[PDB]
Design an enzyme around this catalytic site. Structure first.
Site, PDB file in Angstrom:
ATOM      1  N   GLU A  29      52.401  49.073  35.298  1.00 51.71           N
ATOM      2  CA  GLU A  29      52.332  48.261  34.048  1.00 51.71           C
ATOM      3  C   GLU A  29      51.081  48.654  33.434  1.00 51.71           C
ATOM      4  O   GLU A  29      50.757  48.474  31.427  1.00 51.71           O
ATOM      5  CB  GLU A  29      52.520  46.661  34.718  1.00 51.71           C
ATOM      6  N   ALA A  87      49.806  34.460  28.045  1.00 46.43           N
ATOM      7  CA  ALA A  87      49.127  34.631  26.640  1.00 46.43           C
ATOM      8  C   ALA A  87      49.823  36.196  26.342  1.00 46.43           C
ATOM      9  O   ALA A  87      49.776  36.017  24.873  1.00 46.43           O
ATOM     10  CB  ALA A  87      47.613  34.814  26.826  1.00 46.43           C
ATOM     11  N   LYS A  90      55.034  38.570  27.868  1.00 44.80           N
ATOM     12  CA  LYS A  90      55.800  39.483  28.909  1.00 44.80           C
ATOM     13  C   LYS A  90      56.339  38.638  30.162  1.00 44.80           C
ATOM     14  O   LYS A  90      57.165  38.961  30.205  1.00 44.80           O
ATOM     15  CB  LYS A  90      54.857  40.524  29.507  1.00 44.80           C
ATOM     16  N   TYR A  96      62.666  31.048  38.936  1.00 41.17           N
ATOM     17  CA  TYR A  96      64.540  31.104  38.582  1.00 41.17           C
ATOM     18  C   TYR A  96      64.540  32.831  38.168  1.00 41.17           C
ATOM     19  O   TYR A  96      65.583  33.009  38.750  1.00 41.17           O
ATOM     20  CB  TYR A  96      64.609  29.729  38.078  1.00 41.17           C
ATOM     21  N   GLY A 102      55.199  43.222  25.030  1.00 41.12           N
ATOM     22  CA  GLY A 102      54.020  42.090  25.632  1.00 41.12           C
ATOM     23  C   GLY A 102      52.961  42.447  27.298  1.00 41.12           C
ATOM     24  O   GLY A 102      53.772  43.682  26.995  1.00 41.12           O
ATOM     25  N   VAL A 105      48.867  42.963  31.817  1.00 43.33           N
ATOM     26  CA  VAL A 105      47.810  43.234  32.883  1.00 43.33           C
ATOM     27  C   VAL A 105      47.341  41.777  33.577  1.00 43.33           C
ATOM     28  O   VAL A 105      46.855  42.479  34.665  1.00 43.33           O
ATOM     29  CB  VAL A 105      46.778  43.980  32.181  1.00 43.33           C
TER      30      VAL A 105
HETATM   31  C1  LIG Z   1      44.408  50.068  29.645  1.00 43.03           C
HETATM   32  C2  LIG Z   1      44.994  48.797  29.280  1.00 43.03           C
HETATM   33  N1  LIG Z   1      45.031  48.755  27.503  1.00 43.03           N
HETATM   34  C3  LIG Z   1      44.779  47.739  26.877  1.00 43.03           C
HETATM   35  C4  LIG Z   1      44.865  47.988  25.191  1.00 43.03           C
HETATM   36  O1  LIG Z   1      44.101  48.535  25.057  1.00 43.03           O
HETATM   37  N2  LIG Z   1      45.177  46.582  24.860  1.00 43.03           N
HETATM   38  C5  LIG Z   1      44.801  47.118  23.196  1.00 43.03           C
HETATM   39  N3  LIG Z   1      45.278  45.002  22.986  1.00 43.03           N
HETATM   40  C6  LIG Z   1      44.697  45.069  21.752  1.00 43.03           C
HETATM   41  C7  LIG Z   1      45.960  44.138  21.492  1.00 43.03           C
HETATM   42  O2  LIG Z   1      46.777  43.322  21.314  1.00 43.03           O
HETATM   43  C8  LIG Z   1      46.451  42.002  22.099  1.00 43.03           C
HETATM   44  C9  LIG Z   1      48.059  41.555  22.581  1.00 43.03           C
HETATM   45  C10 LIG Z   1      47.342  40.186  23.118  1.00 43.03           C
HETATM   46  C11 LIG Z   1      49.060  39.590  22.991  1.00 43.03           C
HETATM   47  C12 LIG Z   1      50.314  40.049  23.290  1.00 43.03           C
HETATM   48  C13 LIG Z   1      50.150  41.899  22.791  1.00 43.03           C
HETATM   49  C14 LIG Z   1      51.520  42.578  22.322  1.00 43.03           C
HETATM   50  O3  LIG Z   1      51.444  43.777  22.064  1.00 43.03           O
HETATM   51  O4  LIG Z   1      52.537  41.745  22.752  1.00 43.03           O
HETATM   52  C15 LIG Z   1      48.484  42.242  22.251  1.00 43.03           C
HETATM   53  C16 LIG Z   1      44.314  43.512  19.420  1.00 43.03           C
HETATM   54  C17 LIG Z   1      43.430  44.562  19.648  1.00 43.03           C
HETATM   55  C18 LIG Z   1      42.907  43.697  18.014  1.00 43.03           C
HETATM   56  O5  LIG Z   1      43.513  43.234  17.358  1.00 43.03           O
HETATM   57  O6  LIG Z   1      41.746  44.900  17.797  1.00 43.03           O
HETATM   58  C19 LIG Z   1      43.858  45.717  19.990  1.00 43.03           C
HETATM   59  C20 LIG Z   1      43.737  45.759  21.227  1.00 43.03           C
HETATM   60  S1  LIG Z   1      43.665  46.740  22.513  1.00 43.03           S
HETATM   61  C21 LIG Z   1      45.218  46.976  27.846  1.00 43.03           C
HETATM   62 CL1  LIG Z   1      46.174  45.596  27.834  1.00 43.03          CL
HETATM   63  C22 LIG Z   1      46.068  47.710  28.907  1.00 43.03           C
HETATM   64 CL2  LIG Z   1      45.901  47.367  30.214  1.00 43.03          CL
END
Ligand SMILES: Cc1[nH]c(C(=O)Nc2nc3c(OCc4cccc(C(=O)O)c4)cc(C(=O)O)cc3s2)c(Cl)c1Cl
Ligand SMILES: [Mg+2]
Length: 204
Positions: A29, A87, A90, A96, A102, A105
């Site tokens: 994940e 949030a 996912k 159920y 998404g 983590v």
């Molecule tokens: C090891 C590891 N790395 C990351 C990771 O770099 N993730 C990141 N997510 C974002 C982000 O989106 C967050 C979000 C929230 C809700 C639904 C989604 C989606 O993909 O559907 C996505 C936005 C931005 C921005 O605007 O600069 C940067 C980042 S870096 C994670 Cl998590 C784990 Cl664990």
């Protein structure tokens, strides 16, 4: 409410908590969210480390999880994605019905007796610690950096994971070879600090 549901019914989220399946799925994940950051065009290298105490860290060099205060929750966006199951978009708390896209983590956070989050973003290093998914302090600046990316290190809960509590290198290596082949733009490193074993996967 979200993390509580995961702690109560971990089977529904991560798979068998007794035969090592769920335990390795925890790594998968975290890696999947790093791969999403590579897919999106930002992450070019992922480092997976099995620590001597059978915690696992995943480092990426993408954007870093956003650190600014979340307009709805009033705590860092990073804390919201770590602690509010829905949030990430996912998983939800339905007991159920058990998807594809998404950020997942928060399930790893819920099922970890400890989790360390380090984010390099906008010239600053940020750190937060959780225990069983509960933040121990607000996301804090620890220093300056010229890099960006996200590091998650998690200690699987020995209250959740029974029998198989130690990572099998080969199980993680196989999934990272698959992910390296499919994500031909990403370099994936696997490091085992228990016995010094290391590999580098990158499509040639
Ligand atoms: C090891 C590891 N790395 C990351 C990771 O770099 N993730 C990141 N997510 C974002 C982000 O989106 C967050 C979000 C929230 C809700 C639904 C989604 C989606 O993909 O559907 C996505 C936005 C931005 C921005 O605007 O600069 C940067 C980042 S870096 C994670 Cl998590 C784990 Cl664990
Ligand atoms: Mg619900």
């Amino acid at each position: 409410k979200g993390l509580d549901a995961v702690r109560k019914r971990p089977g529904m989220y991560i798979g068998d908590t007794d035969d090592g399946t769920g335990l390795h799925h925890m790594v998968f994940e975290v890696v999947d969210n790093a791969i999403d950051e590579a897919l999106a065009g930002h992450c070019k290298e992922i480092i997976v480390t099995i620590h001597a105490d059978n915690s696992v860290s995943v480092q990426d060099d993408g954007r870093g999880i956003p650190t600014g205060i979340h307009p709805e929750e009033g705590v860092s966006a990073a804390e919201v994605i770590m602690t509010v199951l829905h949030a990430g978009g996912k998983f939800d708390d339905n007991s159920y019905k058990v998807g594809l896209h998404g950020v997942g983590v928060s399930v790893v956070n819920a099922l970890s007796q400890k989790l360390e989050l380090v984010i390099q973003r906008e010239g600053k290093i940020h750190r937060q610690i959780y225990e069983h998914g509960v933040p121990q302090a607000p996301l804090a600046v620890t220093g300056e950096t010229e890099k960006t990316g996200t590091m998650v290190r998690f200690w699987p809960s020995l209250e959740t994971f029974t029998n198989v509590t130690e990572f099998e290198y080969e199980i993680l290596a196989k999934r990272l070879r698959e992910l390296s082949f499919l994500n031909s733009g990403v370099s994936i490193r696997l490091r085992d600090k228990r016995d010094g074993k290391e590999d580098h996967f990158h499509y040639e």
